[PDB]
């Protein structure tokens, strides 16, 4: 099956560069166009180019002419884009993707997508606290659990639950930037209040570009009211 | 450079319904040299790349539901969705796929509505973890519900916060398009330890009143 594998996401200073890979399986790479779309929140796709890997054909939308190189290499199956002089305005996510089979027909395969974050501020880490599930985070025997991923720059970072097991009731919220300028969230998950004494439930996150990985296990707690008996 | 308008902006549409989006170019996309017209369509549901539906225009990719109808000539065009799903919750682009620079229309949003969805609320302590680090935040999960308009408030011992609490809302669920949210507030481990009682106080349609989640410090 055809397949198109990107590069990592990444942090860049102002002025710098940063080049973003595209990798191709399942076709011949040299028979289709690699196409190049910018998404930035407000703005919907943008064209940035293509290029017909081993002819060394390009097509520029105007606007990126100084700041997009493509390159490709036909050995290796992987196409290439640099973008150069880099300013918050190219903070972004970076889409490959493929022409279609039948010929001016969509791009029918699409690269997962490679966020860059144009930022002076350094990488960093999170921590990872458990929302423990409790009495008070359960409702007709449905129980709340969870992990906040607190203080990490940049953007992103990844939850899953018990590896992959647990997909069902996840919510995992969009970051927010904290006023200290690094970002937070939580993933969260609805099970049977009555597992938790028998059903282990670990959190796995990852934050790539500080290369930190946590499985935090979330323990349940018990509730009770500050009384003498 | 062939400009490409998608319009409306946004629809909102109960599932079961039929909705019809337009998209304009700028020029002609019918090319008079085999008579077909080079505009395609794509869906991006929420987290993931954009999916190709529709090419020249009325031809359905391969696994496309019969449903998806894509019609029009030149410069006018419409993408038609019959028996909306829940998971048809999408930004649609159209493309000139005619003549470089290729070009995309802004996008045309379409979202669920559907019968009131009470959330349920859930409240977490800080964790002994956090603490130790010396802060302390506590979560407030309103799950599930319909629709999006919804007011968290934190109460610290009967006291309205302000300015320490930040919240952060999903997109439409794929299967039962409601809405999550999450409210946290934080605070230093010694101005959490001042204080007996934090609560969620929680406003939204599904609820007759306001309905408040609480707990006392060490409780939990
Ligand atoms: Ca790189």
């Known amino acids: 099956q055809v397949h198109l594998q990107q590069s990592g996401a990444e942090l860049m200073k102002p002025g710098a560069s940063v080049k973003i890979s595209c990798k191709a399986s399942?076709?011949?790479?040299?028979?289709?166009?690699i196409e190049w779309v910018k998404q930035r929140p407000g703005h919907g796709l943008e064209w940035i180019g293509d290029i017909l890997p081993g002819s060394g054909s390009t097509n520029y939308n105007e606007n990126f002419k100084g700041k997009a190189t493509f390159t490709a290499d036909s050995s290796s199956n992987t196409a290439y884009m640099q973008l150069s002089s880099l300013t918050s305005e190219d903070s972004a996510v970076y889409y490959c993707?493929?022409?279609?089979?039948?010929?001016?027909?969509?791009?029918?395969?699409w690269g997962q997508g490679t966020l860059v974050t144009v930022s002076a501020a350094s990488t960093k880490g999170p921590s990872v606290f458990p929302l423990a599930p409790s009495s008070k985070s359960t409702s007709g025997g449905t129980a709340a659990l969870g992990c906040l991923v607190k203080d990490y720059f940049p953007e992103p970072v990844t939850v899953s639950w018990n590896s992959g097991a647990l997909t069902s009731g996840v919510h995992t919220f969009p970051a927010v930037l904290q006023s200290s300028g690094l970002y937070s969230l939580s993933s969260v998950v609805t099970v049977p209040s009555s597992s938790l004494g028998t059903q282990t439930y670990i959190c796995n996150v990852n934050h790539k570009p500080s290369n930190t990985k946590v499985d935090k296990k979330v323990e349940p707690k018990s509730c009770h009211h500050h009384h003498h008996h | 450079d062939i400009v490409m308008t998608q319009s409306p902006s946004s629809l909102t549409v109960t599932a079961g319904e039929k909705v019809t989006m337009s998209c304009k170019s700028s020029?002609?996309?019918?090319?008079?040299?085999?008579?077909?017209?080079?505009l395609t369509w794509y869906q991006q549901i929420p987290g993931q790349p954009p999916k190709l539906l529709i090419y020249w225009a009325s031809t359905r990719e391969s696994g496309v539901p019969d449903r998806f109808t894509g019609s029009g000539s030149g410069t006018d065009f419409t993408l038609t969705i019959n028996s909306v799903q829940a998971e048809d919750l999408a930004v649609y682009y159209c493309?000139?796929?005619?003549?470089?620079?290729?070009?995309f229309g802004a996008g045309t949003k379409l979202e669920l509505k559907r019968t009131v969805a009470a959330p349920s609320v859930f409240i977490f302590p800080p964790s002994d973890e956090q603490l130790k680090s010396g802060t302390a935040s506590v979560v407030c999960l309103l799950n599930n519900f319909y629709p999006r308009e919804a007011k968290v408030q934190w109460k610290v011992d009967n006291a309205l916060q302000s300015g320490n609490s930040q919240e952060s809302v999903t997109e439409q669920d794929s299967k039962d398009s409601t809405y999550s949210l999450s409210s946290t507030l934080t605070l230093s481990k010694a101005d959490y330890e001042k204080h007996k009682v934090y609560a969620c106080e929680v406003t939204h349609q599904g609820l007759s009143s306001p309905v408040t989640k609480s707990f006392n410090r060490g409780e939990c």
């Open positions: 020029q002609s996309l019918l090319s008079s040299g085999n008579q077909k017209n080079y």
């Open positions: 993707a493929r022409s279609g089979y039948y010929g001016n027909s969509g791009f029918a395969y």
């Open positions: 493309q000139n796929d005619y003549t470089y620079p290729l070009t």
């Open positions: 399942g076709y011949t790479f040299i028979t289709y166009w």
